[PDB]
């Protein structure tokens, strides 16, 4: 169960920004966060473990983008969205966010994986147009 996912280890090797959540815990909080994610967001590891990643959202984040993540999770569909996120210091960035369920043999979702890619403002407008 623990980081023995090939794909998690692949992601660390590529120095990606990601978190793992555990939905058997109430509110599906973060139980792993990569150094990339911490550097991107300005948070320390002990500021994110045990928190739902919605803390990155703020008043100018689009509730429809968030709604699309929520429904993806409910319907067990992989999702990709571009949404505005906030770092610890309150500065904002556009996050191309990729979320997938990690399932066992029986089809049970044992974790979720989220990978963040920081994108430019121009990238985000173009994306959100289509």
Annotated binding-site residues for Mg(2+) read 46, 49
* Angle of CA points 52, 54, 57, to nearest 5°: 160
Distance (Å, whole) CA 124 – CA 119? 7
Other beta carbons less than 10 A from residue 111's beta carbon: 21
Sheet strands (E) in the chain:
17-21, 30-33, 79-86, 92-103, 109-119
Q: Pick from 12, 16, 28, 80 the residue near Cl ion by CB under 5 A.
A: 28
Which stretches of the chain bind ligand 9O9, using CB under 6 A? 19, 21, 28, 52-54, 56-57, 66, 69-70, 73, 83, 85, 95, 97, 99, 112-114, 116
CB of 99 to ligand 9O9, least distance (A): 5
81 binds, among ligand 9O9, Cl ion, none (CB under 5 to 8 A by kind): none
Nearer CB in complex with ligand 9O9: 43/112 = 112
116 binds, among ligand 9O9, Cl ion, none (CB under 5 to 8 A by kind): ligand 9O9
Nearer CB in complex with ligand 9O9: 11/53 = 53
- Decide: is 61 part of the binding site for Cl ion (CB under 5 A): no
- Decide: is 96 part of the binding site for Cl ion (CB under 5 A): no
Q: Rg of the chain over CA atoms, in angstroms?
A: 14
- Residues for the chain: how many in total? 130
Distance (Å, whole) CA 22 – CA 8? 14
Residues in the site for Cl ion, rule: CB under 5 A? 28
């Amino acid at each position: 169960g623990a980081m023995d996912y090939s794909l998690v280890k692949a992601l660390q090797t590529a120095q990606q920004n990601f978190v793992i959540s555990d939905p058997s815990i109430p509110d599906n909080p973060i139980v792993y966060a990569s150094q990339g994610f911490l550097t991107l967001t300005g948070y320390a590891l002990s500021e994110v473990l045990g928190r739902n990643c919605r803390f990155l959202q703020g008043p100018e984040t689009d509730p429809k983008a968030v709604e699309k993540v929520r429904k993806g999770l409910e319907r067990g569909e992989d999702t990709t969205v571009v949404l505005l996120n906030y770092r610890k210091d309150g500065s904002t960035f556009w996050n191309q966010l990729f979320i997938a369920a990690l399932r066992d043999g029986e089809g049970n979702v044992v974790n979720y994986l989220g990978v963040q890619c920081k994108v430019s403002e121009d990238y985000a407008k173009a994306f959100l147009k289509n």
